[PDB]
Design an enzyme around this catalytic site. Structure first.
Site, PDB file in Angstrom:
ATOM      1  N   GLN A 266     -13.119  -6.902   4.752  1.00 52.37           N
ATOM      2  CA  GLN A 266     -12.729  -7.493   6.038  1.00 52.37           C
ATOM      3  C   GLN A 266     -12.599  -6.367   7.065  1.00 52.37           C
ATOM      4  O   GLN A 266     -12.737  -6.590   8.287  1.00 52.37           O
ATOM      5  CB  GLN A 266     -11.441  -8.241   5.838  1.00 52.37           C
ATOM      6  CG  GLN A 266     -10.377  -7.422   5.248  1.00 52.37           C
ATOM      7  CD  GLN A 266      -9.167  -8.207   4.719  1.00 52.37           C
ATOM      8  OE1 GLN A 266      -9.041  -8.341   3.454  1.00 52.37           O
ATOM      9  NE2 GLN A 266      -8.316  -8.632   5.554  1.00 52.37           N
TER      10      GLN A 266
ATOM     11  N   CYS B  66      -8.617 -11.900   5.758  1.00 52.95           N
ATOM     12  CA  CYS B  66      -8.164 -12.356   4.375  1.00 52.95           C
ATOM     13  C   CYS B  66      -8.838 -13.807   4.205  1.00 52.95           C
ATOM     14  O   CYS B  66      -9.557 -14.334   3.284  1.00 52.95           O
ATOM     15  CB  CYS B  66      -6.861 -11.863   3.823  1.00 52.95           C
ATOM     16  SG  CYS B  66      -5.374 -12.448   4.632  1.00 52.95           S
TER      17      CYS B  66
ATOM     18  N   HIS C 126      -1.098 -12.377   1.994  1.00 52.80           N
ATOM     19  CA  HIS C 126      -2.504 -11.958   1.884  1.00 52.80           C
ATOM     20  C   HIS C 126      -3.183 -13.013   1.005  1.00 52.80           C
ATOM     21  O   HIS C 126      -2.626 -13.446  -0.026  1.00 52.80           O
ATOM     22  CB  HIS C 126      -2.559 -10.553   1.283  1.00 52.80           C
ATOM     23  CG  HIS C 126      -3.944  -9.962   1.182  1.00 52.80           C
ATOM     24  ND1 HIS C 126      -4.880 -10.089   2.202  1.00 52.80           N
ATOM     25  CD2 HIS C 126      -4.561  -9.272   0.186  1.00 52.80           C
ATOM     26  CE1 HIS C 126      -5.999  -9.503   1.821  1.00 52.80           C
ATOM     27  NE2 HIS C 126      -5.818  -8.985   0.625  1.00 52.80           N
TER      28      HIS C 126
ATOM     29  N   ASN D 152     -10.835  -9.584  -4.295  1.00 54.93           N
ATOM     30  CA  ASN D 152     -10.150  -9.041  -3.110  1.00 54.93           C
ATOM     31  C   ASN D 152     -11.115  -8.845  -1.939  1.00 54.93           C
ATOM     32  O   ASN D 152     -12.308  -8.529  -2.136  1.00 54.93           O
ATOM     33  CB  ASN D 152      -9.483  -7.691  -3.466  1.00 54.93           C
ATOM     34  CG  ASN D 152      -8.473  -7.287  -2.422  1.00 54.93           C
ATOM     35  OD1 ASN D 152      -7.929  -8.331  -1.680  1.00 54.93           O
ATOM     36  ND2 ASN D 152      -8.160  -6.134  -2.159  1.00 54.93           N
TER      37      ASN D 152
END
EC number: 3.4.22.2
Length: 212
Positions: A19, A25, A159, A175
């Protein structure tokens, strides 16, 4: 309900992304969610634009805050483009959706998994990946360069990421950081401990579109 659930070797998740210096996120987590389902029926794996989700979702606060559960809803309602006809840049801007032209992907609804129930998380994660939240503001989860995270960490969720598999004991998460984190952009957290909330509050609020 296999003893092992990996969607990677299932041809459901694409390469990892970042990102960047964009608090986004939420839109990334989503693109993976919708994505998964989109490939689960049609048999066509795709990379959709998160950038679009940023510039379009005014309900979310783009480059710094959002709801993985607006994004999805959004798509289902409207749709979402490829990550080629709307590649990620990292900065929130004007919606290009319309200007971009015809949509490419569009779901048929969004549903949420009953918070605080691993048994429930898995099932859904078994039928198709899901968008999940947790505590990342972590100073440990931040340093994870491979392993099974147990902590320490907290219950202050903030998150959003994605679950793309689990084991008798470890839950797999994708992630939104570079492949220069955890285990190649991947991180394994531990399940079955009693922690209802779930370590790092990974059991707070999870989600997913629908597809016919």
């Amino acid at each position: 309900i296999p003893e092992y659930v990996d969607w990677r070797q299932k041809g459901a998740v694409t390469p990892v992304k970042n990102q960047g210096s964009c608090g986004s996120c939420w839109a990334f987590s989503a693109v993976v969610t919708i994505e998964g389902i989109i490939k689960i029926r049609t048999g066509n794996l795709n990379q959709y634009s998160e950038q679009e989700l940023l510039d379009c979702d005014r309900r979310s606060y783009g480059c710094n805050g959002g709801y993985p559960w607006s994004a999805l809803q959004l798509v289902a309602q409207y749709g979402i483009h490829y990550r080629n006809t709307y590649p990620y840049e990292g900065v929130q801007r004007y919606c290009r959706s319309r200007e971009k032209g015809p949509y490419a992907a569009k779901t048929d609804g969004v549903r949420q998994v009953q918070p605080y129930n691993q048994g429930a998380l898995l099932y859904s994660i078994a039928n198709q990946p899901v968008s999940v939240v947790l505590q990342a503001a972590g100073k440990d989860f931040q340093l994870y360069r491979g392993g099974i995270f147990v902590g320490p960490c907290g219950n202050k969720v903030d998150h959003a990421v994605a679950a793309v598999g689990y084991g008798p004991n470890y839950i797999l998460i994708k992630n939104s950081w570079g492949t220069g984190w955890g285990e190649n952009g991947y991180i394994r957290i531990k399940r079955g401990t009693g922690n209802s909330y779930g370590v790092c509050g990974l059991y707070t609020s999870s989600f997913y579109p629908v597809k016919n």
